[PDB]
Structure 1
Amino acid sequence: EYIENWNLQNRRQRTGFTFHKPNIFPYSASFTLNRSQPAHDNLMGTMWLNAGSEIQVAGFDYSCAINAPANIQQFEHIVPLRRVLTTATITLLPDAERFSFPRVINSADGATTWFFNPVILRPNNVEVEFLL
C-alpha cells in the first residue's frame, strides 16, 4: 500500500491510506468556563479529552439551567482536524465516561483548584456536523 501510494503521489494522483483508529487528534485535555467566578461554586462550560481517535466532551452547568431561557443551556465543541479524513466509520455514544465522576481541577492560571461533582443528564438535541 505504501509503495502504491508512493508511486501514485509521484505522478500527483489521489491516494488513500486506510487506518484503523487513526491518531488524528493531538493530546488536548483541557476545559472552558463560559460562566465562572473566583468562588467556583456556579460554573458553566465544556470539558474535553481529544486523544488518539477519541473525543470525549462534557458540558456542565451547576445551576442546571434554572435561569437559562426555556431551561435549556446550549453547548458547542468544534474540533478542527489537520488532514481531511474520508469515509470514516465513527462510533457516536452519549454519556462521556471520563467526565462523569467527582474530581478537583486546577484553574486556568493554575492558581487554585475547583471541585466538580457531576450528575449525568442525557444529551438533549445532539447535532453532530462534519464540516469541510
Structure 2
Amino acid sequence: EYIENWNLQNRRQRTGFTFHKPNIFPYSASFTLNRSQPAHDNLMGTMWLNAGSEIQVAGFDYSCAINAPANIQQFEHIVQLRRVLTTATITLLPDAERFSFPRVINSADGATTWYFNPVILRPNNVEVEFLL
C-alpha cells in the first residue's frame, strides 16, 4: 500500500491511505465559558477532549437554562481536521462519559479552580455536520 501510494504521488495521481482509528485530532482537553463569574457558581459553557480519533464534548449550564429564552441552551463545537478525510465511518453517541462525573477544573488563567457537578440530560436537536 505504501509503495503504491508513493508511486502514485510520484506520478502525481490521487493517493489514498486507509486508517483504522486515524490519529487525526491532536490531543486537547480544553473548555470555554460563555457565562462565568469570579466565584464560578453560575457557569455556562462546554468542555471537550479531542484525542486520536475521538471527540468527546459536553455543554453544561449551571442554571439548567431556567432563564434561557426558550428554556433551551445551544451548544456548539467546531473541530478542524488538519487533513481531508474521505470515506470515513463514524460512531456518534449521545453522552460524553469523560465529562459526566464531578471534578475540579483550573480556571482559564490558572488563577483559581471551579467545581463541576454534572447531571446528565439527553442532548436535544443534535446536528453533526461534516464540512469541506
Q: Say whether 1:47 aligns with 2:34.
A: no
Q: 1:81 maps to which residue?
A: 81
Q: SS of the residue aligned with 1:90?
A: coil
Runs of at least 5 residues in structure 2 that lack an aligned partner in the other structure: none
Q: 1:4 maps to which residue?
A: 4
Please list the CA deviations of residues 47-94 of structure 1 after superposition, one character each: whole Å capped at 9, or x if unmatched.
000000000000000000000011001000000010000010001001
Q: SS of the residue aligned with 1:29?
A: strand
User: In structure 2, how many angstroms separate the alpha carbons of the residues matched to 1:8 and 1:73?
Assistant: 49
User: In structure 1, how many angstroms separate the alpha carbons of the residues matched to 2:16 and 2:78?
Assistant: 25
**With structure 1 as the length reference, what TM-score do the two structures score?**
0.99
* Structure 1 position 103, deviation (Å): 0.2
Give me the CA root mean square deviation: 0.4
User: In structure 2, how many angstroms separate the alpha carbons of the residues matched to 1:100 and 1:6?
Assistant: 45
User: In structure 2, how many angstroms separate the alpha carbons of the residues matched to 1:95 and 1:77?
Assistant: 14
Q: 1:67 maps to which residue?
A: 67
Q: SS of the residue aligned with 2:70?
A: helix
Please list the CA deviations of residues 13-56 of structure 1 after superposition, one character each: whole Å capped at 9, or x if unmatched.
10110000000000000100000010100000010000000000
User: In structure 2, how many angstroms separate the alpha carbons of the residues matched to 1:85 and 1:67?
Assistant: 40
Quick one: percent identity of the two aligned structures? 98
**With structure 2 as the length reference, what TM-score do the two structures score?**
0.99
* Structure 1 position 117, deviation (Å): 0.4
Q: 1:106 maps to which residue?
A: 106
Q: SS of the residue aligned with 2:123?
A: coil
Q: SS of the residue aligned with 1:10?
A: helix
Tell me the number of residue pairs that the alignment of Structure 1 and Structure 2 aligns. 132
* Structure 1 position 107, deviation (Å): 0.1
Q: 2:14 maps to which residue?
A: 14
Runs of at least 5 residues in structure 1 that lack an aligned partner in the other structure: none
* Structure 1 position 98, deviation (Å): 0.6
Over 4 Å off, 4+ runs: none
